[PDB]
Amino acid sequence: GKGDRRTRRGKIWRGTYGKYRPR
Partner RNA sequence: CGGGCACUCUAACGGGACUGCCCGCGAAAGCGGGAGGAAGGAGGGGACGACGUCUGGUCAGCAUGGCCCUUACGGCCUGGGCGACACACGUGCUACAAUGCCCACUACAAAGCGAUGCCACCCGGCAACGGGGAGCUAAUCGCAAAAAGGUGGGCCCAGUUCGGAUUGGGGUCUGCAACCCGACCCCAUGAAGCCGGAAUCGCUAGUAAUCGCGGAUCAGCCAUGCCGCGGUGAAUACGU
Q: Residue numbers of the site for RNA (CB under 7 A)?
A: 1-20, 22-23
Tell me which of RNA, Mg ion, none is bound by residue 14, counting a contact when its beta carbon lies within the kind-specific cut-off of 5 to 8 angstroms: RNA
* Rg, Å, the chain Cα set: 7
What's CA 1's distance to the chain center, in Å? 9
Q: How far is residue 1's CA from residue 10's CA, in Å, rounded to a whole number?
A: 6
Quote the least distance from Cβ 15 to RNA, whole Å. 6
With CB under 5 to 8 Å by kind, the binding choice for 18 among RNA, Mg ion, none is RNA
Q: Which residues bind Mg ion (CB under 5 A)?
A: 4
